[PDB]
């Protein structure tokens, strides 16, 4: 009879091996754009030259030609441009064919099918479907990155690292991305069908799927509950009743997962490093390249005029009316795409941030902004520049506020505080990379403030004491906060020096929770004298307010008789007790390994509702939630469980211990698995 498909063979494990996506948990046959892909046509005959195989492609709700989103292409001898079919050999009734897909095509979920002419009449019949992703490895390909090991890192790795902390301490945090997953993938890709652009009008979303810019900006919208519309619900009160606190998440795997299986309902709760981890998983699935950022001392200028206010009142107590502008640190990501829109030299690294922090074109989205750009004050370009310079080059102010004469005064200026030590791990480490040379010029020099004025310009058409707070002793939940304080006159005299102190908790962004101690003192010290006021905040006296941020603000406004006040402020890091993870027995794939967590409470009371969360990808599937017993005091927990590791190499295991008096302590380990 006439020419017709008796069945066909994907080749899937050779094409995804090739296209690299072989990594990914599903069965499916994922493939990456601007690239070819072999199979075998086995047909119930011969082919013949009279006959005609034209193959249909098509992605989206409304399949368009002239959109890309659908494309219609003979199997020929040669190829051609854009979508091609090529007839490499034909042993009797087996066809070997290889298709190619344009560099510039729409990602997404695609299907195959078959349009055969043979003997006067046609025919069709589908053949499949299939992902097409972003091409990281087609240098035509706007997200292509050369360097080998640069793409296996921001692009093949699903164990990270997001550093935390303060400007004084800086931290890390491990971070299951998890791209590869159980459903992650396709969840990912679900995303950009529920996004407002796509309710909005579906087929032009679609047909914009074919640009890192458009498929970034989306992304740093939907990551979030805002706009009614999203994955994580942003939470910085230091309640977090009716979801789980921040702090204790581990990766982006449970978070994703949760969002689909609630629902679509908004996941509780996230803050900054949340919507940064879980953003660059949905941005590596794609292929997009992309890693986590962390800036300290982030300024959210409200105002466009590169200038941040905080206040405090002559007590020594830090004002709500500015206390959270600028963040002990703010985490976001940055893609890397050629950027057709801003030039050749706007290409690169670009900030992608889904933090519901400010509402851009009315939603809360944010990026992609050019780097390079952000480093030259070249604000008018898109998207958001304005808010993430001020966010990296602001201008910090202190006020004194007072509320019974309702005056206000300036007390001093820095432009050197605001975005220090910004980091993102290391390619193929948990080394810290700074990269503060790559957002602006270094700080004190001609480029700085020119830039700075540029921006600025674009946008808006005697002491006699010093100051200085000190940790003295090793700061821990449990134990007691000794701080001291230091003062030295400068001047050739004996000043008397009044001195008003305040401490309260804070979430990491500068929300004030609580007073937890507060003091007054005069000292009289003689010429270039140096005091010491011991400052001293008992586990009662902070327990009862701390959050799992773990953070103490502590400020001094110090006062003469006839100068200005001298603002002393500090930031503090309470340690939590040592969680510990230990590997039994040398690791190996599809072989049981004997893992312990241990934990010992230093409390003079016992810790309740335990309970252990561990998971890693590779090393365990999805996440393994365990109750522990009460513990008493000054005793230790001894739990023990059994992984079986999946894929060989390096892995990373991650585990959370929370209990009533200590939420989220975390523990990680890196885990050798041999083949
Ligand atoms: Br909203
Ligand atoms: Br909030
Ligand atoms: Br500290
Ligand atoms: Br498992
Ligand atoms: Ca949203
Ligand atoms: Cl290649
Ligand atoms: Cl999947
Ligand atoms: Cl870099
Ligand atoms: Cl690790």
């Known amino acids: 009879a006439a020419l017709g498909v008796q069945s066909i063979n994907w080749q899937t494990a050779f094409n995804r091996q090739a296209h690299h996506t072989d990594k990914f948990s599903s069965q499916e046959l994922i493939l990456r754009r601007g690239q070819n892909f072999q199979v075998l046509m086995i047909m119930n005959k011969g082919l013949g030259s009279n006959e ?80 097409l992703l972003f091409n990281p490895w087609l240098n035509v390909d706007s997200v292509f990155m050369g360097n080998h090991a640069e793409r296996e890192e921001y692009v093949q790795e699903d164990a990270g690292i997001i550093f935390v902390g303060s400007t004084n301490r800086i ?82 795997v449970e978070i994703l997962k949760n969002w689909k299986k609630s629902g679509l309902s908004p996941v509780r709760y996230g803050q900054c490093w949340v919507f ?58 940055e893609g890397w795409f050629v950027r057709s829109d801003l030039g050749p030299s706007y290409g690169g690294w670009q900030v992608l941030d889904a933090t519901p922090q400010e509402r851009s074109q009315g939603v809360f989205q944010c990026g992609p902004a050019s780097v390079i750009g952000v480093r030259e004050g070249d604000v008018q370009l898109n998207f958001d520049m304005p808010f993430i310079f001020a966010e990296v080059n602001a201008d910090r102010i202190t006020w004194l506020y007072d ?29 810290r990379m700074d990269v503060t040379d790559k957002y602006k010029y270094p700080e004190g020099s001609d480029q700085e403030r020119q830039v700075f004025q540029k921006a600025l310009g674009k946008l808006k058409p005697e002491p ?7 940790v003295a002793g090793m700061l821990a939940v449990g134990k007691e906060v000794n701080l001291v304080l230091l003062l030295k006159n400068l001047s050739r005299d004996t000043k008397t020096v009044t001195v008003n102190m305040t401490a309260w908790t804070i979430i990491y962004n500068g929300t004030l929770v609580h007073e937890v101690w507060k003091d007054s003192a005069t000292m009289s010290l003689d010429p270039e004298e140096e005091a010491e006021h011991p400052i001293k ?139």
């Open 52 to 131: 005609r195989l034209e193959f249909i492609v098509s992605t989206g709700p409304y399949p368009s030609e002239s959109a890309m989103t659908k494309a219609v292409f003979p199997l020929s001898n040669g190829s051609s441009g854009g979508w091609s079919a090529v007839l490499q050999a034909s042993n009797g009734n087996t066809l070997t064919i290889s298709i190619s897909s344009p560099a510039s095509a729409p990602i997404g979920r695609y299907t195959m099918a078959l349009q055969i002419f043979s003997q006067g009449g046609i025919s069709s019949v589908k053949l499949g479907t299939f992902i």
């Open 403 to 431: 509320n019974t004469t309702g005056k206000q005064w300036k007390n001093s200026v820095n432009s050197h505080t605001i975005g220090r030590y910004i980091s993102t791990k290391a390619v193929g480490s948990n080394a």
């Open 276 to 333: 940064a981890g879980t953003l660059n998983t949905a941005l590596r699935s794609l292929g997009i390249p992309s890693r986590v950022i962390t800036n300290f001392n982030s300024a959210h200028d409200t105002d466009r005029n590169l200038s941040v206010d905080v206040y405090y009142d002559p007590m020594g107590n830090p004002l709500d009316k500015g206390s959270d502008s600028v963040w002990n640190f703010h985490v976001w990501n």
């Open 171 to 252: 931290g890390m945090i491990g971070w299951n991305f998890g791209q590869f997953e159980e459903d992650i993938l396709s969840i990912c890709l679900s995303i950009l069908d529920r996004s407002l652009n796509f309710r909005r009008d579906a087929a032009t979303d679609v047909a914009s799927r074919n640009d890192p810019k458009y498929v970034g900006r989306v992304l740093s919208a939907m990551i979030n509950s805002n706009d009614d519309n999203g994955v994580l619900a942003g939470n910085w009160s230091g309640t977090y009743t009716g979801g789980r606190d921040p702090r204790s998440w581990d990766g982006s």
């Open 464 to 470: 006699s004491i010093i100051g200085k707070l000190k």
């Open 537 to 675: 905040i008992s586990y009662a006296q902070y327990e009862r307010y701390l959050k799992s941020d773990n953070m103490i603000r502590i400020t001094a406004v110090c006062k003469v008789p006839d100068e200005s006040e001298v603002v002393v402020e500090r930031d503090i890091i309470l340690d939590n007790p040592t969680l510990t993870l230990e590997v039994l027995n040398e690791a190996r794939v599809r072989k049981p390994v004997n893992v312990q967590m241990l934990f010992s409470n230093p409390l003079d009371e016992p810790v309740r509702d335990c309970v252990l969360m561990v998971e890693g990808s590779g090393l365990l599937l999805g996440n393994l939630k365990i109750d522990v017993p009460t513990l008493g005091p000054k005793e230790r927990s001894r739990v023990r469980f059994d992984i079986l590791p999946s894929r060989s190499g390096t892995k990373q295991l991650l585990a959370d211990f929370s209990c009533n008096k200590f939420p989220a302590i975390k523990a990680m380990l890196s885990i050798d698995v041999a083949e």
